[PDB]
């Protein structure tokens, strides 16, 4: 993560209590003032860091991180400055929602930078509650019963995500098969619009394992673009204005390499 607030993530390998070791992005010596590298790790004093629902989350929306405490009966965070100042522990006027499960945990639709959980699927909509790192009551709503129902967590050659194909900035619910894409308009509290299909995507249903897809916007517009793995090549699908999709770019992998279930693709601004 970018714990330091570089505007660039650092590689904070961490293994055990204390193993917090930030391989950090550094300018290369020589050349244009563009060349950058991950320098060596560093150790810094840190929380016991375990059994706690560990994560370097900014819970408050500062742009600057806390670390989550959620052990059995044990609940709050610390805050960490760019200096690495792990502030003293913070009980939180604590009233987080009961964690039944992570399954279908919402984030965005409370409003940008205000993220909060909702656990949800068909015919109902729990309400988010986060303000500024505290929470309201987690109220109940539903949209109108005609509205098509988005629901996370089936592997059958299919995916669901909170990710903005549309590029408004709202990481809309989108559902993907081997063959089609549908996306639900943001409607705020407890509500969604009838979904829009986005034309153009497909893949052979014989072989479309869902996880071979990758989610990023590439064009820089905001419209989330699409990538799919062949063992030799990437198929890259670019979002037409948030409406449909271009002919896929086919990209040859590094020579002799083959992509496989070990491989982890990502995109980043290293």
């Amino acid at each position: 993560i970018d714990l330091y607030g570089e505007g660039t993530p650092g590689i904070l390998y961490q293994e055990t209590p204390g193993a917090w070791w930030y391989k950090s992005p550094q300018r290369q010596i020589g050349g244009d003032s563009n060349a950058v590298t991950y320098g060596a790790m560093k150790a810094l004093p840190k929380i016991p860091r375990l059994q706690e629902g560990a994560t370097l989350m900014d819970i408050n929306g500062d742009g600057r991180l806390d670390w989550v405490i959620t052990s059995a009966g044990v609940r709050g965070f610390h805050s960490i400055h760019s200096t690495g100042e792990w502030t003293h522990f913070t009980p939180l006027n604590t009233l987080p929602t009961e964690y039944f499960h992570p399954k279908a945990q919402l984030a965005d639709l409370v409003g940008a930078g205000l993220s909060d959980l909702v656990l949800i699927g068909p015919k109902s909509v729990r309400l988010y509650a986060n303000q500024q790192g505290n929470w309201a009551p987690a109220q109940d709503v539903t949209q109108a019963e005609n509205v098509s129902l988005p629901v996370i967590g089936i592997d059958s050659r299919q995916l669901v995500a909170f990710a903005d194909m549309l590029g408004s900035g709202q990481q809309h619910l989108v559902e993907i098969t081997a063959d089609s894409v549908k996306c639900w308009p943001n409607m705020g509290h407890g509500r969604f619009g009838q979904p829009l299909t986005l034309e153009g995507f497909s893949q052979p249903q014989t072989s479309f394992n869902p996880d071979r897809v990758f989610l990023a916007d590439i064009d820089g517009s905001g419209t989330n673009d699409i990538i799919y793995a062949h063992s030799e090549c990437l198929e890259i699908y670019l979002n037409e204005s948030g409406n449909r999709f271009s002919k896929p770019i086919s990209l040859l992998l590094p020579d002799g390499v083959n992509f496989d279930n070990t491989c982890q693709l990502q995109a980043a601004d290293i």
Binding site: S207, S231, N258, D260
Partner: peptide
């Protein structure tokens, strides 16, 4: 050792390589 696939319909072009794992015990 001998190794072979058995389902004939299944595509195999996906295959990169095979890695074995062995637990063994030893004297000194």
């Amino acid at each position: 050792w001998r190794l072979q696939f058995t389902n004939l319909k299944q595509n195999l072009d996906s295959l990169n390589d095979v890695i074995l794992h062995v637990k063994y015990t030893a004297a000194i």
